[PDB]
Design a protein around this ligand. Structure first.
Ligand SMILES: Cc1ccc2oc(C#Cc3cccc(C(=O)NCCN4CCN(C(=O)c5cccc(C#Cc6oc7ccc(C)cc7c6CC(=O)O)c5)CC4)c3)c(CC(=O)O)c2c1
Lengths: 138, 136
C-alpha cells in the first residue's frame, strides 16, 4: 500500500522527537514535542499524505484515548510491529549550530534527508519517491 | 509547480497561517501566537514539497530577518503580489469545531477535509502536478 507508515520516538538535548517514516520511500516527518501531541501529529500527517496504516514497536500509543480518537477520525489503522533515527541525528549534528532552537535544527535535518539523493548523485530523493509512489497508485 | 501563496486569518483571537499551493488548492496551516513562527512553518513546508516562490500581498514578511534567513537556507523566493480560501476553511472549521477541544485540532481537521474532498482532491492534484513534473 502507499499508506504504510512507521512511527517512533528519539531524544536529543532532553527533548522528544516524533518521527514518522513512509516505509516504501524513506520520506520522513518529525516534530519536537504525550498522547494529545501524537494524535495532533498524526492528524496533520494524514491530512497531507495517504495514511492508512501506522506501525509502532511498543505499547505507548495503544494507551492514549486521543490517539485512538485520531485514528478513528482519520481512518488510520494502528498496528503493532515493525536506524533512521540515527541517520537523522547525525544530520541534526551537522546543522545544529545554524539555528538556536533544536526544533529548527530537526526540520533542517528533515529537509536534507528528504531532498538529498542516495549517495549524493542519481535517482530520486525520498521526497520524490513518496510522490512517485502515490502518483502511480492513483 | 513550486508556487505558493502565504496568508493570515484569525479565529477565536488566534492567528492561523495558511499556505496554498496555487495550482492545486492544496493547503497547509498552523495556529501560531504571532517572524520566527513564519520562518519555522516555511522551513517545514519546504522540506515536504517543492517550494520555489511564496507570494504574499502585504509587507509583514519582508520585515523579518528569520523569514529572510529561512528563504535563503531553503532556496525560496519571496515575491510580493498575490493575484477566498480563508473563508472556505473557516466554514469547515465551523462544521467541526465541536469535535475538538483545541482550535488547533479543528483547523487541522478542516485542512484534512479541504485537501481530501472532491474527480481529484487538492491532495491528489498537488501530487499529480509534482509527479507529472518530475517526469518532465
Ligand atoms: C480526535 C483528535 C485528533 C487529533 C487531536 O490533536 C489534539 C491536540 C493537541 C495539542 C495541544 C497543544 C499543543 C499541540 C502542538 O503540537 N502544536 C504544534 C507545535 N508548535 C507550536 C507552535 N510552534 C512554536 O511556537 C515554536 C517554538 C519554538 C521555536 C520556533 C521556531 C523557529 C525557527 O524556524 C527557523 C527557520 C529558519 C531559520 C533560518 C530560523 C528559524 C527559526 C528560529 C531560529 O532558529 O533562530 C517555533 C511551532 C509548532 C497540540 C487533540 C486534542 C483535542 O483537540 O481534543 C486531538 C483529537
Amino acid at each position: 500500500s502507499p499508506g504504510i507508515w512507521q512511527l517512533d520516538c528519539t531524544h536529543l538535548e532532553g527533548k522528544v522527537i516524533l518521527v514518522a517514516v513512509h516505509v516504501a520511500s524513506g520520506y520522513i516527518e518529525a516534530e519536537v514535542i504525550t498522547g494529545q501531541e501524537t494524535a495532533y501529529f498524526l492528524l496533520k500527517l494524514a491530512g497531507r499524505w495517504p495514511v492508512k496504516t501506522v506501525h509502532t514497536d511498543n505499547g505507548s500509543n495503544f494507551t492514549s484515548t486521543t490517539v485512538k480518537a485520531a485514528c478513528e477520525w482519520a481512518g488510520i489503522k494502528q498496528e503493532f510491529g515493525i536506524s533512521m533515527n540515527k541517520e537523522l541525528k547525525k544530520i541534526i549534528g551537522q546543522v545544529r549550530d545554524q539555528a538556536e532552537h533544536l526544533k529548527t535544527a530537526v526540520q533542517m535535518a528533515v529537509f536534507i534527508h528528504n531532498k538529498k539523493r542516495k549517495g549524493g548523485i542519481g535517482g530520486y530523493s525520498a521526497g520524490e519517491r513518496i510522490v512517485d509512489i502515490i502518483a502511480t497508485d492513483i
